[PDB]
Amino acid sequence: SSQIRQNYSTEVEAAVNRLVNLYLRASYTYLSLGFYFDRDDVALEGVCHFFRELAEEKMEGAERLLKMQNQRGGRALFQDLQKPSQDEWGTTPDAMKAAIVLEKSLNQALLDLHALGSAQADPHLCDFLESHFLDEEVKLIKKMGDHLTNIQRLVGSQAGLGEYLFERLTL
Template sequence: MAWCFRNIRRHMGMLVRQNFAKSCEKKLNEQINMELKACHQYLAMAYHFDRSDISSPGLHGFFLKASAEEREHAEKIMTYMNKRGGLIVLSSVPEPLPCFPSSLAALKHALKMELEVNQHLLDLHALAGKESDPNLCDFIEANFLQEQVDGQKILADYISQLERAQNDVGEYLFDKYMGTGMHPANRIP
């Protein structure tokens, strides 16, 4: 009996499904899982830099904020999937890298992750175009693409600044000013 009601409820959810290809649904599920993987990795990075032997409060705050944003992205996509009548499939999140030899290595890893997430979004957008799904194209454009480009630029700027620091005092000052919003995109107006 319970099985019957579940199938009826699932069928009712499918009533809202229109012009939503299974290939797009699958790619959106992959994107959700990529966002959750990035959330998990950023959380591990944040608390690596919060350790007493590392003590980089600027990087801790930066990566903590990045973790929250990645989770928000996953939740936004899940909400969208439910609106379109899709089925959300969450996979296990791989274990994140536990620590980094330097702030620079962590920022380079973050940029690599963001480039991978962005490429997946671009592939998803191309697939939505191929499947003639203008709603999905609009959702990706309106919610993700520009934010990804902006985030990549901030990380690239931080990497350049930290590469110029080249010593412990420079890294200390980098972290100190990071907490105060040294990048124009992070400053409070």
């Protein structure tokens, strides 16, 4: 029995492990999305950079969750990482929609975990998630939504031209 563990439920410990898996898998998805936009027959460098930076941020989220698990006296447990949902990611709007779907699923897991900690009366967990995760998610999702609106407006006009202009002038 842990020499430091206090007010830390087995349910929260398990939930944090699942969330690590979800962050790792999102990182993997972004690695894939990034290298797809690096293909010579896709060739949108700004889009590649966008998603590769997101891969690093998700990996950072997982590491932060793992650090907290140990701080609280929980034990990190890792599961297999399922490969990303697609091998090819279509056009800029397809990939940005996919990204928002992924982020919304992360945000919901965060929200579920926050509801669990609140039901378990775990204020440290609730402060940890609010400080480092919940606002970062809101801000990123807003940014993605802004990007989708701009991409959609551009590719309604002329699809190839619009995609090029967005990568050049926004990304």
